[PDB]
Ligand binder design. Structure first.
Ligand code: GSH
Length: 109
């Protein structure tokens, strides 16, 4: 399907992806967590309240990840969870490890 192809191609073609809705505070929280390490222009935020086929994309996200809710965050193709999860991973060091492994974050000393 178009929705499946969109999601698969997006997460395999972009290192940091957040499927989002503009109005959702969990999406905002996930974005702010990622922005501690990366600029906005390196975060691929797909707004499913803007896309006409947003519901179809959420349906595929249920198939791929186990849930439909936004956000759904992917690092180098790996689903890492929603907004609370992404914020927790930012705080606990694991997000940085994933971003460095993905080649989009340098060590800074
Ligand atoms: N605890 C979840 C909450 C996510 C959530 O429930 N988001 C709402 C929007 S505030 C949602 O997806 N609603 C259903 C929908 O938009 O389909 C997280 O951390 O991401």
């Amino acid at each position: 399907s178009a929705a499946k192809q969109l999601v698969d191609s997006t997460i395999s073609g972009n290192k940091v992806v957040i499927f989002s809705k503009t109005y959702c505070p969990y999406c905002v929280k996930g974005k702010r967590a990622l922005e501690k390490f990366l600029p906005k222009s390196k975060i691929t935020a797909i707004e499913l309240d803007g896309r006409n086929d947003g519901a179809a994309i959420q349906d595929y996200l249920l198939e791929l990840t186990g849930g439909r809710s936004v956000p759904r965050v992917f690092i180098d193709g790996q689903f890492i969870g929603g907004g609370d999860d992404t914020d927790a991973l930012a705080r606990n060091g694991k997000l940085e490890v994933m971003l460095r492994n993905a080649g989009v974050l340098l060590e800074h000393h």
